[PDB]
Ligand binder design. Structure first.
Ligand SMILES: CCCCCCCCCCCCC/C=C\[C@H](O)[C@H](N)CO
Ligand SMILES: CCCCCCCCCCCCC/C=C\[C@H](O)[C@H](N)CO
Ligand SMILES: [Cl-]
Ligand SMILES: [Cl-]
Ligand SMILES: [Cl-]
Ligand SMILES: [Cl-]
Lengths: 282, 49, 282
């Protein structure tokens, strides 16, 4: 008491259908905007022209981020060939990174942060699309859990990790996954480094790598002591569900080159829009 | 020396802020820890051997 | 509200006379003290011996700091000789520093800070004690005011500074002075430097100098266009009044050497107490 110096405006609204149009006539300066402020023109039809009444029942439900994202998309293709350089071992460990396929990636990168649960579907077959009576095991190996070093590895005992056993002939396996980041949300962009220290050019592959997005390894194998005679192709589809998103940003307008960064082909910088001869001719 | 674990917490050794902690303890319930199918046996019936 | 971490025991007493003594008998451990704490024994007569009742009316009024300090003491001796090296000029400018005389100085240095008003008395005469019909002018020249450069100096016009005109034959001149420091109190000890910068050995005379104690200059002259034939001796006495004091400290036990610092003769360090031959003999 003996010292006197020690004593968000915007909100939501539910709009199920597009706004309507009201009538007006031959009649305050609402046509000229001060776009220098960083605001979008609040001028509508009724201001610049004479209008009729239109009872607009067009629905806005399909543009809800949920209907936009909750569509299963390809995020990975894993192959286990029998003859070659890949894995004549009968098993494969895949670091989880969903940024290897553009269609989905570009959609997510529309936002800076995203939080959601997901439905993963596992479509498996031979490289030509044929199916055979082969038993498989998919296992989720969280960060810290021991990764299988072979098709015989004890890790396939899967006493605590979650594993799925399914035949290549059964329908696609399918499961639900919760929001697992240790942060409040996954983030497609992390303008920083994961650790302290000097950031010499040798460790610049560190830039942009966010541990909170690193969900571990996904392992798969044929279930047998002996090698399987079949080459295997596994396509993993992901369907986002129960999603929330923050901070929209410009959409990628240059082809993707790498999973972990926004590097672009500097010699061939594509223009966002097609070109024409003259500004006065279509 | 008694065989007891320190009943001293944050508020005792340092100045703290109020934190409304909603972290759930359901996953460490022995049921969620054990109710995960695990391999307990491998039985083989070969034809030649 | 959305954050929960953002939401003197001793007093005075009036004792006009010394505390009394009450009776006791042949009877809790009040004789043994824990002086390790930094406390003075709260054990009195009634605890260590059998006592009688004594109605003690001894007064504590004389030990009040006011009666202790409000006794005029010599703080300066200013001389204006006619034949010599001093001031055959007829005027003198004296920087005000009251630390040139021990009796008073030691008393004040009992405290660290002191605030008070004062009564200055000016006893003037010839060097042999004789008096003559000589007119004098004493003037207070505050910091910033122009100091007289001669007996004719315009500064003696004293249009704003306060001046006193008195004859060497009139009784001593006497005036009251207010508490003039720009600080809350004068301080006999200032453990620091007056300005910023490096404190090279060339400017070490700065250490301990506190501007808040520098009250300016005291000027005096004979009132005449012509030189006076009389040597003059001025003794200035000061009587502290309306005083308050803080933070008592050890009393000087070494002879004073300089006005502005506590330097002491290192080769001859005096013991606070006289000595004897044996610790078992008086
Ligand atoms: C037995 C079923 C196993 C299925 C387990 C799959 C868990 C996958 C969790 C989805 C994690 C979202 C992706 C997060 C971050 C991005 O990939 C990062 N940019 C990679 O550094
Ligand atoms: C015409 C009458 C003129 C009389 C004016 C006398 C004013 C003197 C004010 C008393 C100041 C107290 C002394 C203060 C500080 C000490 O002298 C310091 N240690 C000096 O550096
Ligand atoms: Cl096994
Ligand atoms: Cl959703
Ligand atoms: Cl004059
Ligand atoms: Cl007083």
């Amino acid at each position: 008491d003996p010292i006197a110096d020690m004593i968000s405006l915007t909100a939501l609204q539910v709009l199920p259908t597009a706004a309507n149009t009201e009538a007006s006539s031959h009649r305050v300066v609402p046509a000229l905007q001060a776009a220098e402020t960083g605001a979008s023109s609040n001028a509508s039809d009724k201001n610049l022209i004479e209008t009729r009444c239109v009872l607009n029942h067009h629905s806005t439900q399909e543009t809800a981020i949920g209907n936009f994202f909750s569509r299963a998309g390809l995020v990975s293709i894993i192959t286990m060939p029998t003859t070659g350089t890949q894995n004549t071992d009968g098993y494969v460990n895949w670091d989880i990174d969903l940024m290897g396929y553009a269609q989905l990636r570009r959609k997510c990168e529309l936002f800076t942060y995203m939080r959601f649960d997901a439905e993963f579907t596992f479509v498996v077959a031979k490289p030509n699309g044929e199916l055979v009576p082969q038993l498989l095991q998919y296992m989720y190996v969280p960060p810290g859990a021991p990764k299988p070093t072979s098709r015989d590895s004890f890790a396939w005992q899967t006493a605590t990790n979650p594993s799925v056993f399914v035949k290549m002939t059964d329908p696609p396996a399918q499961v639900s996954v919760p929001f697992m980041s240790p942060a409040s949300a996954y983030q497609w962009f992390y303008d920083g480094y994961p650790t302290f220290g000097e950031h010499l050019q040798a460790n610049d592959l560190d830039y942009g790598q966010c541990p909170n997005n690193m969900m571990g390894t996904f392992s798969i194998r044929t279930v047998g002591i002996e090698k399987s005679p079949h080459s295997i192709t596994l396509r993993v589809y992901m369907r986002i569900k129960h999603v929330r998103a923050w901070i929209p940003r410009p959409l990628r307008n240059q082809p993707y080159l790498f999973k972990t960064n926004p590097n672009y082909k500097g010699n061939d910088i594509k223009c966002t829009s097609t070109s024409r001869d003259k500004i006065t001719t279509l």
